[PDB]
Structure formats: C-alpha cells, structure tokens
C-alpha cells in the first residue's frame, strides 16, 4: 500500500565514496593459457570418455525392460531405410546399391562415436539434391554409356569426403555454436523452397520422360520447360501406377495418426505397397509389355577402396561448405526435439565430430553424404526405440539385402519410388501457412521468410541461402536505424517520469530538458540522435557560440577605437551611436570563432541573456540544464564515442550543464578506456537516477 | 541534500486506471498515400526549386565581396585539374586527352544540379583505377595497337554511362540515407589497401617496363612479379627523373602547411616543375637521346556522341554497381566538412542526382566516370573561392588546352607525372597507425580495420568491399551474443538494487530471486538467456513438474486399492510399509508428466515442500517469487517471444510468481500483437519498479 523512502542525494562518485567494493581479479591470459595444459590424473579420464562416449553408456543397459523394444523398432527402421536408400540414389543421377551403401556406413560409425539414442543416420532429399548439383558442374569443368556413370560416381564419393573433412575440422576447433546463426523463419522459408525443387525433380519419372543436366540459376524453369515441350512421349502405365499408390499411401498415412492410441503398431503400408507392385510387375511381365522402367540387377557386394581427387577438390569447396553446414543444422534440430522430451545432454562438437567421420568412409567406399531424415527418425522412435542398438539392427538388415537377397527387387518400377518419395513432403508443404501469422504478428519476420524462398527458387539451393544469411543480418540494422525519441516529464508530484505526450496535467520545471534514446548507439543512428536532440531543446548550441564568439569581436574593437566606457557598472557608450558591419573572416581565420570564450580581461561579467550595449544583438535561450537518460542504452562503439564528446562540449561552452542518468557500473569502466573524460568532460556528471539529478539542480540553483 | 518520497505501490495496471491517459490515433497509410500528393500551388513551387538549385544562388550573389576571390581560386583549380587528368587516364589505359574531356563536363552539369559551395568535381585515383580493371574484363569476354586502344575507350565510356543510371534511380526512389551502412572503421581500412594499389601501379611509368593487363583475385602480386622479373631493362633517365620531382615537391609541400600564414597564396610547386621539365626535355632532346617515353600528340577538339552498347552492359553489371556507391561514397564525406565548417545545409537526394547526370554526359563525350578529389577541393577551398562559380573558371581553363594549347605538352614524360600522383598518397598511408589506437580503444573496430585491409588487398577493390560490408554486419551479432547477466541484492535498506557480488553487507529477502540481462533478447542470445536462468535459481521447473506429476500418479495407485486413506485431515496410510513399483511409461503416453496439476478430487491441500507418506520422494525448492529486470532489453522477435512464454509457463505450475519490471509504453503494446496475453499468463505481471514488485510481495506473504 505504501512506498516511503528517505534517503540522501547521490551521484555515482558520492556512492562509491560511501560504500565499500569488493576486491576483483583481472584472469590474465598467460595464467588463463596455463589452465588446459596440466592434465592432471582425473582430468584424462574426462577427456578420453568424452570423445568416445559408447564406453559409458553400454555397461549401463537395461537388459531386461530395453531389449526386446529395440529389435521391433530395428526391424521396422531398417526396412524403411532400405527404401529410402534406393529412391534418393535416383535422386543423385547414379545407378541404386550406392544408396544401399550410403545407409550402410554412417550408422555403423556413429554406433561408437554419437551422442543422441533416437535419431537415424543416413541420406535424406535435399542434401541429396544438392550433392547431384555439386556433380554435375564438377563434371562440366574437368579440362579435357557405363564411363558416363563411372565418372558420376567418383565425383559424388570425392565430395561426401572433402564435406566430411570440413566437418571434423569444424569439430576439434571447438566452434559447435554455429547454430545460432539461423532463425526460424529462414529455415521455414528454406525447406518450402526445397519440397518444391523436390516436387519438380520426380516428374521425369512419373512420365517417364528424358530431361538434361540443368544447373543454377533458374534451374528449377529449365526443368519444367523441358518436360511439358513433349508432353505427348508420356507412358501412361507409370503414371497410373504411381497415381494408385500415392493415393492408397496418403489415406493409410492419416488413419495411422488419427488413432494412433487405438493401434498396437503403426501399419506399414508402404512395405506392402511395394510388395504387391513388384509381383504385379513381375507376374504380368509388364517391362515387355508396356515398356515400364525397373531397377533391375544390380552386382552382389561392396565395392573395393578409392583414393580422393584433388582435382575435383579444387571445384567443388565452395560446395562442399554448403553441404556441410545444411547437414549439421538439420540433425541438430532434430536431435533437440528428442534430448528435451526424455531429457539427456547433448553435445554438438561430438556430433560434428561423429558425422564427419561416418562421411568420410562413406565416400572412401563409394557412397554419398547424408545425416539425417525426420521421417525414418518419427518411424524409429514411435516403434519404441530406446537406445542405439536399433540403428545397428537396421544397418543389418541392410546388409543383408546388399549380399543375399537383392535379386528380389529387380522387377520393381521406378514410378513407385517416385512416388513414395512425394508422399513424405506434405510437412513443409504446409509451412505456406507461416505468411498469414508472421504478417499479423512481426513483419520483420515476415520478409525473412518471403526473401528466403524467392533466393532458393530463383538462385540455386547453395547460394541462396549465403544471400537469405546476409540480408537476415541486415534485418538487425533496419530495426535499430530510426529510434523512437522522446521528451519527459513529472506525473504526480513523486519520483515517476513519463513521456510528455502521453498524460493531461504533467509538470516541467523551468530551465530542464529530460530525453530519451530507446535503443543503443552505435555508427549507423548517432547522426539520427544528434538530430532529434536538437530538434528537442529548439536550438543548435554551436551557431549560439559562433554568434557570441562575433559580438564579442566587435566589443573588443569599440574598447580600443575609444568608444565604449568600460565601467563597472555596464557598458556605457559615450558615443550613443555606432555602425553595424561584418569584419569579413577569410577561409583561412574563421575557425577562431569556434573556441571557448575568455572574459578574465574585463572586470565585469556579461550576462548573454540580456541585452548588450551600442544596438548588439545573439539570439538567447532558456535553458540551463539538460538530462540524459540513458537506461535502454547497451553499448557503444568508437564512432559514437566520439560523437557524443563533440555534442557534450558544445553545450559546456555556453554555459549549459549536463547530466547523465540509468546507467550500470560496467558502463562506466568501458567509457574510460576510450579516454573520454578530461578537464571539461568529468565524470562527476553521472547521477544514480532522474530525480537524483532534478533534486541537485534545485538545490543549486536555490 | 534529501530524497524523500511517500506515494502508492503501483503496477502498470493500476497507475493506468487512476491517470487519464489523451487521445492518441492510430498512423493510417491511407491518408499518407492521398495527403503527399496534394498538388497545391506553394507545395509545387517548392520542388522546382529543389530540384534546379541554381535558381536560388544565383540572383541572390554577393557582387563586390565575392567576384575577386571566385577567379583568383578558379585559375588555380583549372591548372591542377589539367594535369592530374592527364595522369588518371594512365592508369585507365586510354589516351591522354579522354582525361580531359572526364575534367570538362561533369563541372559544367554541377553548375546547374548541385548544393554543394566548396567541391572540385572530376576524377580521382582510386575510382580510375576500378574502371580500368572494369574494361579489362569486359575485353576478355566480348564475343569473338591503335584497334585495341579503340576498343579500350568504348568500353569505358560505356561503364561510365551505366554507373551515372544507377545514381540516378537511387536518387529520384529517395535512398540518400544509405551512406549510414559504411562506418568509419571500415572505410579507413579500405582507403589504405587501396593506396597501396596505386602505389603498386605506379612502378610500370617510373622504371618505363611493360606489362600485361592483369585481373583479380590477387591482382596486386601478379603485376609485382612481372615488374620485378625484368628489372634490368629499366631505363635510368626515367628513374633519376622521377625521384627528383618526388623530392622537391614533397619539401616544398610541408612548408605551405608549416608557414601557412605568411603566405598570401601557396606556392605552386606542381606548375613549376612541370614547366621546367618539359622545357629541358625539350630543349636537350631527351626522346631521341635517352629514349624516354612523352605525352606525345593528341588532336585538338571535341569528339561525336557515340552510342553505348547493349553487351558490355551485360558483362559489366555487378561493376558498375561498385563504382557508384564508392564515388557518391567519398563525395558525401568531402562535402560534408565545409557544410559544417561555413554553417549551409545539404541535400543527399540532390547530389545523387548531379553526380548522375554529370557521369552520363560525360560517357556520351566518351570521357571517364568521376566525382571528387580532396587534394583538389582543398586547393579550391584553400585560395578563397566561395562558390561554384569558382568550378566554372576552372572548366574554361581545361578548354583553352583542348582547343588551343595542347602541342606545349608534346614533350612531357609520363615519368613525371606518375612522380606527381605518387606525391598526394601520403596522407592516405598515414592512416596505419589507427591499428594501435583502435587496438587500445575497441577491439571489435580493429578486428573491422585489418580484416577490410586483408579482404581489399587479396580480392581486390570490387569484391573486398562486399566481403567486408558483410563482416562489419556480423560484428554487431558479436557484441551481443554472450551478454554478462547477474544476480541483484538490495545495498543500504533503501529502494537502491546492484549486482550482489560487487559490494560488502548486502541484503536479499529470502524466497525472493532479481535477474538482469543487459541487452535485447532476439534468436541468437535466447537459448544463452535460458541456460543463465536456470544456472542463476538453482533447479529446472520441468524438472520438478514432472516429478511431482509421477509422485502424485504413485498415489493415486495406491489410493485405488485402499492402501491410503486420504481422509480430510491427513493422509492415512493404513498399510504400513510399502515396496517401490515404478510404471515405466512408454514413449507415446510419456508427454503426460508435463501436465498442470489438477489435486481437486483429494479434497484437502498438498504441500509439495513438507514431507510425504510411504517414503515418496520429490526434490524440494525455497523460490516463491522471481523478478526480471528488463530495462536494457530493447526489443523481441518472434523467437524470443516464444522462448519466454514457455520458461513463464513452466515457474508458474510449481506454484512460483512472475514479476516483470523497468519498461516503457510502447514495448507493452508491441507484446499484446504476438498474442502473449491468455489464461495463465496475465497483463498484471507487470510492474514499475523494483522497490514496487518487492513491496507487493510481502504485504501479500503477510
């Protein structure tokens, strides 16, 4: 009910002098270089655990309640993967076993060296999408039929190893917080601009229809341009076939989610699908019949060793940075949705350093780069995987079908990989909805999203996002650019103060100016601030110098030519009259008027607010005290140091006093570096708050 | 000396409901779209005169004090203008007399457009040296001695006209303001490299060697090595030539700066040597003697208009862009010193505009692009003139040579004047001791300095410019991306809160936590905030949320099969002992535990902090209420907003307040857009002050 305080006044000098500060250290370098290099007994053993993290959470298995739910969720994950391995591999432009093993390798690897317990590792459409890009410009810039797809191949396998070496690289160094960088909104408009270069890469093979190797920009229009000009080629079997199965694999999808509770398992449905249409195929021989293309035969085992090409090194960096950085995001993000939900720790420079070795064997044994679907993710954790073991369950299954059984896949038709792949896109397909919500609620958002997508669509998937990165930085600029501004005042006779625009019967004590920056100062809004100041107290401070700096001149003169008195009592003029005329300051002597004014000569003060003698005449003003509030301000920077000393001292020259109020002590401490404070600009200005400073004005001026 | 206050405790709520607040209207682009075009008789006045300046100068002109000083200024703008053209067209590759049509016409269009009073306008150096580059490119993509110079002149006069369009479009769409994107840390970075270009360039003329016209990346090398290479070819005449112009002209410099006073004019050095030179090599037969390089012949006159081409604008688009921010760029600073120095205002629009349309007439005339010399204005401004008339005098001097007297400066060598253009680079390399002071000032504006010099040396003027606007934009996220939060406490009994680890006998009311962080919260500092708070209170709320859910669920079991009682007043627990079961619940009904506490059915209140029945355990908290100080946070975007809802959610289900404190009017309306506001959380947590929040407090814990 009651707020009743009785204190003293005090500046931010008078309180320190009061009360005691405690004593701090200053960590020097040298001693801060000497901490990491004492590896002291207990320390070893952190370090070593922490790289290869299997070691600590296997002996704690939970045999008896996390074993059987672990083989269920394997078997499903690794069925599911098989799949997926095949469509993204007509994805990247080669022939289908390498997407086998590009599932195969990764998980393997990550078994020993990862950090999460629910996601699946391995090869998802848009990093596909961008490696096929990658090769085909390679390809194109090699200075000077089967060898057309033995040079695919290598490509693809040299560039998954140079993404996973800057991976491990980014990793040792420690700079896993690279995440931060990427907003939601950029990574919303990204993704619906990706499911629809995605959409438009499966129709050569829902139609069946031969299109080029297009590259950026404008990709995307070449594409479709390509495909309808002969429109009339299309095979009508593929597309009644894959029609059927998106058709029956969406209706399932749904029923699945709907009653979710009610199911003891998820139906798979597209293990099925696939199951019927490659016996349908088969038993109605339907590729000599109406000319249907299969996957075929495909040769029984891995592929031996390769060595990286330097050549295509040279080519591709740019490229393979881009790889890189799209395949940490994705993982990471969902890699946090799980650690949250059951809640365990996550470490991001392990999982660098986890992904890029699984990339780099990957593309030594011939496969292509990848981290991580939410698809295959949402099938491993809803079928109740606990740990890891799932992962290495799956990659067997894989395994096996890359040795024993992969013979049983030949007569399947490309339409229903296609067509499977089209069914997993209506997610960030519906992400449209984003531009409805961003407008009502934060339009600088808004245009985020709306510039990503149209740099993704109109330039490739590796530059636009370089572009949608720069112009979201600048984004930051147009929000502190034009400070709102204002001028304050009493409201209540008590210690409140609020915008004077606001209140009806609001009170300014007379000869006091109280104003507001909300933002921080740095080289893009001092020029805006100098500005508003001025327009707030009516004047600008260093034309009323340059016009008192004149009169005096003219003062000066008349005391020497024997025209004025020179009494104690005023100005006199025996002489009542005198001639107005402008001494004429050439180029190179008019910067005399922009110094301080010294009157220890003559014996009596001269008041510049009331009249002066022999028909002189400045402009004069009301004002003899000013107070910044400086509360919302977080920091400056050398451009605005260096501004707001200039704008301080002109205001001490004639004779104003200024106050700076709302600010901490880590401030302060920084505004001595920049060497600031000299004999006119003291640090005795700074006041704890606006009523401290109003209070000391009174007392001194009373 | 006393503060003394007594009033109510207010929350914003209330101080709202008991001051009438003023009738305020919402800003409506409507009437903003109809308002600007009024089209009355005094609005359309106004622009006419805006745009033709010249109108309004010159009927109002100073006749007796200003006509002496116009044309003894004139005349001595007009000889250095002459010379220094003829030296920037080297550096264009292009013959001599092309730089003296680049020094003719934009002055006569400046005359006209201008508003600025003290400018030389023509050519300069730096800018010279991008066209030159420019035209190189465009040659080595074109299509498949005297033809290739004829090719040379029509590309850079192409490149000239497109960059004036660009000036032009900016400056009729009002974007004047975007000089405010370049700071000064930046700018004194890349003047620096860019001198040493000049530098570096000038070698070719001195020791009279040949060498081919070299492009970027790494420009700057390649031509050292190709100098260096064939150093034993260089002709001895030219050196001794040009390193004693170099030395009298560098003496005779400091002494105008040394006695600039007792001078009546400066003495001109530059006319003199240049004189001098040209009479001996004249009279001593240097060209048929020593074999030294001459000005040679050029043919008196103007040239036809020629058209531009359509292909050279196409190969050339992302360099003319380039050129046109960089000369407006350095024009704007020039100006702006005098405007401050002789008190007259100055238009950004209207320069774009002049600038444009000077560049564009030029190009036509087939002459360079250009805008304005320091070294040139200083000498303009530095012998008296007042205003652009001065510009004129200069302009018919350049035409007297053009059509009258060029044959006189048939036997100059190039030696001497790349000997003078090397004498104006001292200022600009002067500049490198800005690394020590930045280095003892501000670390991040050193960091902006040397990575601008690296970037500008290694990728040259174009693209080190970009690659550097870039970086100084991510510096700004580096200043705000670890912010130095902490802990308050109350320091003297009074309504004064600092940081709890910086003074002795400071008091904190217990079950009471006061949090501060000094910056704004947006999506790159949001997950940085959340790990500070919960490190700052002691426990995570989601945490003990779902313990309490499980422990209650525990319970419930047991009260089912009447083991517990549960009777009014106490729990009953008839069993005595008890075995600890544990449900162990799957991954699809896990998300329960995160549920709001519902205890309706048990009809007497459960105190989670005292202890429970049957050995039931749930970790116990002391915080029932939390204050967040918010007066140095700025602004939101949509991922804080959503970042903060979720952390307010989650304190207040374990039964903790929420006080928000320390912010403005405005910052309260923008919350209410995002949809904050609902059920749970409401506007009454916010406060005005500290002092307020911890009064309101333990009244009601009382």
Redesign the interface.
């Known amino acids: 009910?009651?707020?009743?305080?009785?204190?003293?006044?005090?500046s931010t000098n008078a309180f320190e002098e009061n009360?005691?500060?405690?004593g701090r250290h200053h960590k020097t370098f040298l001693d801060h270089l000497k901490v990491c290099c004492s590896c002291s007994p207990q320390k070893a053993k952190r370090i070593v655990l922490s790289l290869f993290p299997i070691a600590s959470w296997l002996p704690a298995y939970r045999l008896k309640?996390w074993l059987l739910s672990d083989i269920v969720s394997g078997i499903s994950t690794g069925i599911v993967a098989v799949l997926q391995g095949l469509a993204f591999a007509l994805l990247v432009d080669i022939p289908p076993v390498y997407g086998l093993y590009a599932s195969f390798f990764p998980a393997i690897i990550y078994l020993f060296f990862g950090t999460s317990r629910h996601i699946s590792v391995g090869p998802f459409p848009i990093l596909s999408m961008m490696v096929g890009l990658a090769v085909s410009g390679a390809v194109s810039k090699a200075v000077p039929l089967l060898d057309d797809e033995r040079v695919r191949v290598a490509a693809a396998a040299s560039v998954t190893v140079l993404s996973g070496i800057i991976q491990l690289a980014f990793g040792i160094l420690r700079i896993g917080f690279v995440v931060?960088?990427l907003?939601?909104?950029l990574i919303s408009g990204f993704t619906t601009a990706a499911a629809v270069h995605v959409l438009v890469s499966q129709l050569k093979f829902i139609f069946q229809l031969t299109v080029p190797s297009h590259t950026d920009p404008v990709s995307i229009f070449k594409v479709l341009y390509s495909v309808f000009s002969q429109i009339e080629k299309t095979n009508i079997a593929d597309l009644v076939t894959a029609l059927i199965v998106l058709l029956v694999v969406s209706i399932v999808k749904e029923i699945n989610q709907r009653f979710?509770?009610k199911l003891p398992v998820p139906i798979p449905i597209e293990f099925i699908m696939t199951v019927i249409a490659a016996g349908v195929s088969y038993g109605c021989d339907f590729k000599n019949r109406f000319k249907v293309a299969v996957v075929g035969d495909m040769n029984p085992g891995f592929q031996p060793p390769i060595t990286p090409d330097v050549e295509t090194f040279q080519n591709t960096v740019g490229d393979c940075f881009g790889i890189a950085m799209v395949a940490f995001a994705v993982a990471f993000s969902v890699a946090s949705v799980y650690s949250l939900?059951?809640?365990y720790p996550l470490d991001g420079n392990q999982e660098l350093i986890a992904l890029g070795l699984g990339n780099i064997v990957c593309g030594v044994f011939r496969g292509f780069a990848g981290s991580t679907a939410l698809s295959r993710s949402a099938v491993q954790?809803?079928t109740?995987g606990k740990t890891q073991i799932a992962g290495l369950i799956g990659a067997i299954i894989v395994l096996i079908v890359v040795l024993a059984i992969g013979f049983l896949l030949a007569p399947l038709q490309k339409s229903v990989l296609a067509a499977l792949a089209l069914g997993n896109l209506k997610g960030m397909l519906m992400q449209f909805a984003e531009i409805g919500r961003?407008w009502?609620?934060?339009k600088?958002?808004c245009l985020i999203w709306i510039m990503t997508f149209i740099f993704t669509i109109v330039l490739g998937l590796g530059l636009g996002l370089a572009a949608s990165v720069?112009f979201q930085?600048?984004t930051?600029?147009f929000?502190?650019?034009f400070p709102?501004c204002s001028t304050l005042a009493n409201?209540?006779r008590?210690?409140?103060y609020?915008?004077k625009?606001?209140?009806?019967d609001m009170y300014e004590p007379e000869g006091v100016k109280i104003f507001r920056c909300?933002?921080?100062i740095?080289?893009?809004?001092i020029?805006f601030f100098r500005r508003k100041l001025i327009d707030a107290v009516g004047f600008s401070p260093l034309?009323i110098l340059?016009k008192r700096n004149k009169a005096l001149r003219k003062i000066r003169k008349l005391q020497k030519q024997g025209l004025l008195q020179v009494t104690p009592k005023g100005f006199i003029c025996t002489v009542d009259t005198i001639k107005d005329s402008d001494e004429?300051l050439?180029?190179?002597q008019?910067?005399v008027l922009d110094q301080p004014i010294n009157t220890t000569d003559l014996p009596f003060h001269i008041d510049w607010n009331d009249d002066l003698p022999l028909n002189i005449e400045v402009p004069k003003i009301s004002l003899h005290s000013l107070i910044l509030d400086f509360?919302?301000v977080?920091?400056l920077?050398?451009?605005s140091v260096r501004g707001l000393k200039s704008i301080l001292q002109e205001f001490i020259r004639i004779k104003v006093d200024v106050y700076i109020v709302?600010t901490?002590?880590?401030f302060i401490e920084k505004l001595n570096?920049?060497?600031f404070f000299d004999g006119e600009v003291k640090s005795s200005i700074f006041f704890?708050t606006i009523?401290?400073a109003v209070?000391h004005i009174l007392?001194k001026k009373d």
């Open positions: 009910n009651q707020y009743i305080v009785a204190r003293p006044v005090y009360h005691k500060k405690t309640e931060i960088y907003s939601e909104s979710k509770d939900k059951y809640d954790e809803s109740g961003l009502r609620k934060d600088y958002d720069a930085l600048l930051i600029v929000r502190t650019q709102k409201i209540g008590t210690n409140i609020k915008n625009k606001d209140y009806y909300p933002s921080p740095y080289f893009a809004n020029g034309r340059r004429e050439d180029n190179n008019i910067e509360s919302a977080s920091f920077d050398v451009s709302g901490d002590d880590d570096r920049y060497e704890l009523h401290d209070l007392m």
